Amino acid sequence: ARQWQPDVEWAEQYGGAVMYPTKETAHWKPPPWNDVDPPKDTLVSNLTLNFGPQHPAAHGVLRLVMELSG
Amino acid sequence: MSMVYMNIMMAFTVSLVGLLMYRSHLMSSLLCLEGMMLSLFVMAALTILNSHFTLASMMPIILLVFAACEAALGLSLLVMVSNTYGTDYVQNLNLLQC
Amino acid sequence: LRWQEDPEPEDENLYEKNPDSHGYDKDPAVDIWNMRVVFFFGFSIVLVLGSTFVAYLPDYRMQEWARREAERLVKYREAHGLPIMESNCFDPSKIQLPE
Amino acid sequence: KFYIQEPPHGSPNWLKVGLTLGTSVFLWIYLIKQHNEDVLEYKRRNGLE
Amino acid sequence: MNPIIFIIILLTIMLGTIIVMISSHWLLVWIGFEMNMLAIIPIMMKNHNPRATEASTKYFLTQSTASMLLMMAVIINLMFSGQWTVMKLFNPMASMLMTMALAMKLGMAPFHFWVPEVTQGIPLSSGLILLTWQKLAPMSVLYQIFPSINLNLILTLSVLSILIGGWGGLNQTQLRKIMAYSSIAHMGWMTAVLPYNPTMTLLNLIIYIIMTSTMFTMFMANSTTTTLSLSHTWNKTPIMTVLILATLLSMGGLPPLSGFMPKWMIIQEMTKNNSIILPTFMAITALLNLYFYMRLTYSTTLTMFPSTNNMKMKWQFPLMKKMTFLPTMVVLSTMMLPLTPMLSVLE
Amino acid sequence: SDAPPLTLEGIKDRVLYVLKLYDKIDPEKLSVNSHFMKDLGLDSLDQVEIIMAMEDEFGFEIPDIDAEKLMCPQEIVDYIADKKDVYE
Amino acid sequence: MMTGRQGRATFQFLPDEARSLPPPKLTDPRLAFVGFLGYCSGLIDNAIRRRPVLLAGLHRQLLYITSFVFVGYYLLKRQDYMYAVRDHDMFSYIKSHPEDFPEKDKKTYGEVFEEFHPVR
Amino acid sequence: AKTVLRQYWDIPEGTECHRKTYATTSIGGAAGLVVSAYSVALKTPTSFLEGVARTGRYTFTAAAIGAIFGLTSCISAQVREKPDDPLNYLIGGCAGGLILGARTRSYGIGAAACAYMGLTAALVKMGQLEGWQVFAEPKV
Amino acid sequence: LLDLIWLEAILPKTISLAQMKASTLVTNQKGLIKLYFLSFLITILISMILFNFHE
Amino acid sequence: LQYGPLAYILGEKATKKMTEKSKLITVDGNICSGKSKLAKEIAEKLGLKHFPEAGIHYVDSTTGDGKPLPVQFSGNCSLEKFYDDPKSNDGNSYRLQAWLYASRLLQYADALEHLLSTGQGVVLERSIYSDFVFLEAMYRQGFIRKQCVDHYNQVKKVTICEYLPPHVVVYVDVPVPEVQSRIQKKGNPHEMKITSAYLQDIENAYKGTFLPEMSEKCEVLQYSAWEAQDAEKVVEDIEYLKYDKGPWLDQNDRKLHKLRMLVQDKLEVLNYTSIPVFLPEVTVGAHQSDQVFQEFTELPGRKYRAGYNEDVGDKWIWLK
Numbered sequence A: 001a002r003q004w005q006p007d008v009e010w011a012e013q014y015g016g017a018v019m020y021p022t023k024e025t026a027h028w029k030p031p032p033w034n035d036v037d038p039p040k041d042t043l044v045s046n047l048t049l050n051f052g053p054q055h056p057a058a059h060g061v062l063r064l065v066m067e068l069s070g
Numbered sequence B: 001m002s003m004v005y006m007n008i009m010m011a012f013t014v015s016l017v018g019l020l021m022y023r024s025h026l027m028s029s030l031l032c033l034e035g036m037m038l039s040l041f042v043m044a045a046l047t048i049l050n051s052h053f054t055l056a057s058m059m060p061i062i063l064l065v066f067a068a069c070e071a072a073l074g075l076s077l078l079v080m081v082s083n084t085y086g087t088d089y090v091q092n093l094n095l096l097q098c
Numbered sequence C: 001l002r003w004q005e006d007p008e009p010e011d012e013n014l015y016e017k018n019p020d021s022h023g024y025d026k027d028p029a030v031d032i033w034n035m036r037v038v039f040f041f042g043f044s045i046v047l048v049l050g051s052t053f054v055a056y057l058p059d060y061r062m063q064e065w066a067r068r069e070a071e072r073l074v075k076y077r078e079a080h081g082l083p084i085m086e087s088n089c090f091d092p093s094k095i096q097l098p099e
Numbered sequence D: 001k002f003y004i005q006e007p008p009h010g011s012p013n014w015l016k017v018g019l020t021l022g023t024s025v026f027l028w029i030y031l032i033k034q035h036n037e038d039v040l041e042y043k044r045r046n047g048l049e
Numbered sequence E: 001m002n003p004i005i006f007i008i009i010l011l012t013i014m015l016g017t018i019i020v021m022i023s024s025h026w027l028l029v030w031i032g033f034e035m036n037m038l039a040i041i042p043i044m045m046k047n048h049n050p051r052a053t054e055a056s057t058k059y060f061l062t063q064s065t066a067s068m069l070l071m072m073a074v075i076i077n078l079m080f081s082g083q084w085t086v087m088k089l090f091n092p093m094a095s096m097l098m099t100m101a102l103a104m105k106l107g108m109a110p111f112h113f114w115v116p117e118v119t120q121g122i123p124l125s126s127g128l129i130l131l132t133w134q135k136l137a138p139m140s141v142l143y144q145i146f147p148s149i150n151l152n153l154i155l156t157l158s159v160l161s162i163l164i165g166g167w168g169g170l171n172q173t174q175l176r177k178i179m180a181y182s183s184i185a186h187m188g189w190m191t192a193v194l195p196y197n198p199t200m201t202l203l204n205l206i207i208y209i210i211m212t213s214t215m216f217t218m219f220m221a222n223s224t225t226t227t228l229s230l231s232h233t234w235n236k237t238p239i240m241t242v243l244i245l246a247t248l249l250s251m252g253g254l255p256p257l258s259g260f261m262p263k264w265m266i267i268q269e270m271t272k273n274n275s276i277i278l279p280t281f282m283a284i285t286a287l288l289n290l291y292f293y294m295r296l297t298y299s300t301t302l303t304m305f306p307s308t309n310n311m312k313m314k315w316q317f318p319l320m321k322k323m324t325f326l327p328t329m330v331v332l333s334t335m336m337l338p339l340t341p342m343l344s345v346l347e
Numbered sequence F: 001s002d003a004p005p006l007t008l009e010g011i012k013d014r015v016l017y018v019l020k021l022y023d024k025i026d027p028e029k030l031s032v033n034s035h036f037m038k039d040l041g042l043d044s045l046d047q048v049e050i051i052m053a054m055e056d057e058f059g060f061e062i063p064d065i066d067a068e069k070l071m072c073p074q075e076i077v078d079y080i081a082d083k084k085d086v087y088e
Numbered sequence G: 001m002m003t004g005r006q007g008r009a010t011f012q013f014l015p016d017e018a019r020s021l022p023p024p025k026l027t028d029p030r031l032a033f034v035g036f037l038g039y040c041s042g043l044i045d046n047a048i049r050r051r052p053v054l055l056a057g058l059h060r061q062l063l064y065i066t067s068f069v070f071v072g073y074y075l076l077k078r079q080d081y082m083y084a085v086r087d088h089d090m091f092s093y094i095k096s097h098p099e100d101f102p103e104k105d106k107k108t109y110g111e112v113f114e115e116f117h118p119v120r
Numbered sequence H: 001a002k003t004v005l006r007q008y009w010d011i012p013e014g015t016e017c018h019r020k021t022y023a024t025t026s027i028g029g030a031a032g033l034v035v036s037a038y039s040v041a042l043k044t045p046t047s048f049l050e051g052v053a054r055t056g057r058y059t060f061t062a063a064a065i066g067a068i069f070g071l072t073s074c075i076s077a078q079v080r081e082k083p084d085d086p087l088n089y090l091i092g093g094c095a096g097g098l099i100l101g102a103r104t105r106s107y108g109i110g111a112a113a114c115a116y117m118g119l120t121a122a123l124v125k126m127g128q129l130e131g132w133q134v135f136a137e138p139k140v
Numbered sequence I: 001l002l003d004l005i006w007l008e009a010i011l012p013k014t015i016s017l018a019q020m021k022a023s024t025l026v027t028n029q030k031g032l033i034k035l036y037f038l039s040f041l042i043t044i045l046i047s048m049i050l051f052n053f054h055e
Numbered sequence J: 001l002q003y004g005p006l007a008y009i010l011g012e013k014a015t016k017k018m019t020e021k022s023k024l025i026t027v028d029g030n031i032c033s034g035k036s037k038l039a040k041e042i043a044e045k046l047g048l049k050h051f052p053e054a055g056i057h058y059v060d061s062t063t064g065d066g067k068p069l070p071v072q073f074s075g076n077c078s079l080e081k082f083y084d085d086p087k088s089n090d091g092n093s094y095r096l097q098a099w100l101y102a103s104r105l106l107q108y109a110d111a112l113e114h115l116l117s118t119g120q121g122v123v124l125e126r127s128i129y130s131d132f133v134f135l136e137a138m139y140r141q142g143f144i145r146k147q148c149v150d151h152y153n154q155v156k157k158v159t160i161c162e163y164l165p166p167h168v169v170v171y172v173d174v175p176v177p178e179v180q181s182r183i184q185k186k187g188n189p190h191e192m193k194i195t196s197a198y199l200q201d202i203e204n205a206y207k208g209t210f211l212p213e214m215s216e217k218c219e220v221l222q223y224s225a226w227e228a229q230d231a232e233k234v235v236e237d238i239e240y241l242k243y244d245k246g247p248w249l250d251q252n253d254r255k256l257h258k259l260r261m262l263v264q265d266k267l268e269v270l271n272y273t274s275i276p277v278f279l280p281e282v283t284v285g286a287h288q289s290d291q292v293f294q295e296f297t298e299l300p301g302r303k304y305r306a307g308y309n310e311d312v313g314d315k316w317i318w319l320k
């Protein structure tokens, strides 16, 4: 016949995270093709501050709620 | 080997054991590296000052200069770890598998 | 299909196109010269001249000489009463046995 | 003109060719001179020529 | 990164290593490592992605700890000899710390866990520096302090490295992790012959660098970082697969290729010192290395894995990668056994 | 990996477990097919509270268009199984 | 083992005493093999960059051959020097310590008894 | 470990089997504690008692293997009146392999462990007699 | 029984099976800085208490 | 000399050659919406280079002698067969789309290289940023499988991130009935088989997913069919754009040097378009691929690197 060459079934043995699957490495998945992981969901924690009313620069009765980063 | 060398060498061992047992914070481990440099500085300064090794008296200073470079370098990495996960926890540094 | 793969080709019988084929190549010109080199260098040279060369090796392994030498020694020793062959290959005078 | 875009190696870079051939000649002359000087010193030190 | 800044940081990495090799004072040796770590990390952070940040951080934590132990050894050696010369250490405890500090820097087992991870997390070019150039400075120090190194400690690390490196490389499909565990195994051969003949440590290091630099150069040419990505090379650059076959066979220690020379010379020196059980165990354990090199040849050169349609578009463009010294390195990494007696120049 | 998968027996047990912690349901009156409104006597807002407990138990968001139809414990099991692909 | 040799020529590629030894012949077989490795590098360079292997860039092929031979010649001089030094030290040490290298009393096989092991 | 080994090799073969069993059991037990440390360090137990349980499981397997080897290899050299015989260690090594099988609940591991631990014990004894060096001191 | 089973099952099939099993132990690692450095501490203590590498 | 670190260090820096006219403009729209005519005119008036829309044979037009190659050297992808039988089992639908993305990805790199190497702007037609409309249309009509869309996003996710978006996005809105009526007038037997549902999926993707995405990063100009005929009006709007948003404001010499190194190495641009993902649509067996590759190397002027082919009259090979 014709010389045998690997098919998709054979090659996908070498596409996993490891060559010898186990229970520990069942949830391992191959890394991204370009080493770049998705950025994590925005968790920026701005600091909220009451600037007034009892504040020298608040003119007495201003409650300025400010989101501060630093 | 006076009784002072015992405590200084014990300080190094405590900071070494402290560095090898992480809790959560990368910053807590960075302090142990700066603690180890402090022990080495004191131990080297004591030996040099006691033996009247005059020219070696600059070695402890050169030891602090390169301790700052490492400390600054460790802080710079801590900024980038924090910017990626919002904390300095070491358990997040596990994308790479052995 | 699981992929885009060429269908397996069928075999080519060299007799179909060249009934005089010697089995060496599709090209009749190459096929004939492939056969001539194999036969001339294989049969006419190596096997025939090699056979004659081996037949006339100049006394391979010195076996014919040892026969003439044995005849010369046998004649010499029988003509002087010496034993045909002794049980000692080396004269004991040169041997110094322990203690 | 066969290529739609001029190849980076369409024509020889005559600067490299001169340096390349020039470098080879220099090394061969240097090596041959080195070999002759080594042989003369060898014979001089061993007192045979 | 600014090209001028990259060049300056690259030269700082070399300067740190060169300071360690020319230093005769322990303090300067320590300064060399600190300068080397200071410059290497920015090259690991170059692409600025989370995996590169983790790799740099794990690398910094390991190297920083080792430098602390090395300074402790120097100071202890100072207390018991009153001098800073870079020679045999004068206290057993100083030797153990320095030996372990140099083992952590080299990534020898059981201080090896970072090598597979740091290499995976950084680009191929940065990985090449990590596994070839970073080994020169620690090997320079071991070469000068070997008379005082505890024999059991150094041989134990060598044996564990040969075992862990071989086993770890079997369960890997990432090329950077395969090259990482291969590196650990080869460190074992360098440090196993160290007590007996430091010259053969240099020979194995030189040959390991040449072969390792050849593999990364060929992976860099095709931008392949996985077994399957490398499995498409036959359909783009057929010649490159033959060179990978010859180099991988050489790395496995098969004669008549170059990589058989370091094993052959290391076995000679150990058998002269009546060490027979260890060379035999080391050679047999090295068959683990040859197995996962053979597995790469199978999926790269000796078989033809499935391709993809878009590959036909890559046939219309040449290789624009520099591939510096690749034609010279591949020849030196395959045909040098007839020149084996040239190892005397290293003495 | 190794954690046991979800089974209709498992889903049914957990659903009936949540409904027993609810204070307005008589534990010895809960049938896997009993209607929340007709049998247990609950009202609209009581049903909403139950669905939120299911979200906490099974850790996924149930929209209002879908939650408006889950009027008995069995319908919850079908919805959770249907959305979790648990055909077992 | 020869790192600290008494020869006070440290970090020199070829100490001046190495000029007493014959240089390698330009027709040295070791030097021809090194030159051949240069030719293989030239051909491999053409193949990876997809050029006519035998014909492309004869100027570059010559520089490969010359570069290899040039470097090879000096590595052979240092290689032969290091082996010459090895024998020099070995013979000097044997001369300086005659008690450790005595001339063994000669015996002949007619006097030495060797056990005989039949093969039967 | 140097102390225990010197104690083991000072007791002549086939004598004082109570002492030799103490020595080997110490060596095996120490090996099981070294394995437990790395296992606990690299595979974090889910709880303190789950990790103490693991330490006791490995330490008892290694101690039992060490105890059975010294006991079985010492009575064998006593009954046969053949101290300097690697066959005594071959019997002891295989018995240790069988104990590993029982603890692992696997007949296959019992057979394989007996074969390879038996050979290793025999090779260890030969090296003691001949003078084989694993970590040989540099001489040339 | 001999060629296809037992001669395979002693030398080639068991030897291969062990290296695959030891490979998983070495590589199945959590990739945590905390656990690796904890093993470094164990190595240093073992190197002194057990093997006396410091003397 | 060839561009690299040495050239950059010696003065070849992108900002020194980019002016206020160094703009990258893309013309988008549905099928038969006047993009080609509009795009070609904006190039002449503004003095910009024009790139005809990337097709199945774009890569052939930049290499060798610039003439299209036989269709076996392109995977046998056919836009004609997609219209006739959009649900064939030989995977010609997605195989075409995956190939076209690689062509647009290549063209965009060619466009960026020209802009960064000489400072002249370029005008494109349906760049990589808008190629997903056809994919979304094929999937919603059952022309490709779900796994194919997963493959497209994986390839796109690792390629689109490396480039910068066009400065100006010109969109020529046309209601579907106008397009369908216009398609029939054009009288192309294959194109006339395009159902109206397919054209409506393209419309939804363009407005609803694409224009909102590009509105926050580019200068989006929308024109109807009636006001798109006079390219003079469109050019006037472009001339008076503020350019107050987009990543292009954050770029400097270092960032553009890294970008130019990527876009000049074409194999590095196409590195991730052939990731080892085994879909039947794109997977090719070893025997077939081997045979086709051998045939490719025996075409005139393609056995050796360009400039070393004797059969096409190249000379000085022995000194080159």
Ligand SMILES: CCCCCCCCCCCCCCCCCC(=O)OC[C@H](COP(=O)([O-])OCC[N+](C)(C)C)OC(=O)CCCCCCCCCCCCCCCCC
Pocket: E277, E280, E281, E284, H107, H108, H109, H111, H112, H113, H115, H116, I009, I010, I011, I014, I015, I017, I018
């Ligand atoms: C200094 C030199 C160093 C040399 C280093 C050598 C390294 C090699 C060491 C590897 C040992 C690995 C042992 C693994 C054992 C695994 C057992 C297991 O898990 O169960 C498998 C199986 C049970 O598994 P199972 O029940 O699931 O079924 C197996 C069948 N399949 C695969 C279909 C499932 O049990 C066995 O078959 C083990 C056979 C035991 C017999 C072993 C005897 C070996 C003796 C040596 C070879 C004989 C020839 C040499 C003669 C010499 C004479 C002096």
Ligand SMILES: CCCCCCCCCCCC(=O)OC[C@H](COP(=O)(O)OCC[N+](C)(C)C)OC(=O)CCCCCCCCCCC
Pocket: H068, H072, H095, H098, H099, H100, H101, H102, H103, H104, H105, H106, H107, H108, H109, H110, H111, H112, H114, H115
């Ligand atoms: C107080 C002083 C005591 C002295 C004792 C003397 C030593 C005797 C020790 C016996 C230990 C014991 O009990 O062995 C018993 C174990 C049995 O297997 P298991 O894992 O328990 O099976 C448990 C199965 N379940 C879990 C289902 C219950 O053997 C074995 O695995 C051996 C079985 C394979 C035969 C190996 C021989 C062939 C290979 C060798 C080739 C050279």
Ligand SMILES: Nc1nc2c(ncn2[C@H]2C[C@H](O)[C@@H](COP(=O)(O)OP(=O)(O)OP(=O)(O)O)O2)c(=O)[nH]1
Pocket: J029, J030, J031, J032, J033, J034, J035, J036, J037, J053, J079, J082, J096, J097, J100, J126, J131, J134, J191
């Ligand atoms: N499946 C698919 N077909 C495409 C793609 N790009 C173009 N085509 C097809 C759609 C059309 O049938 C044909 C030409 O499309 P055009 O947008 O250029 O319309 P046309 O040239 O006829 O008129 P126009 O330039 O807009 O004035 O090519 C694509 O990315 N995927």
Ligand SMILES: [Mg+2]
Pocket: J035, J036, J053
């Ligand atoms: Mg058009």
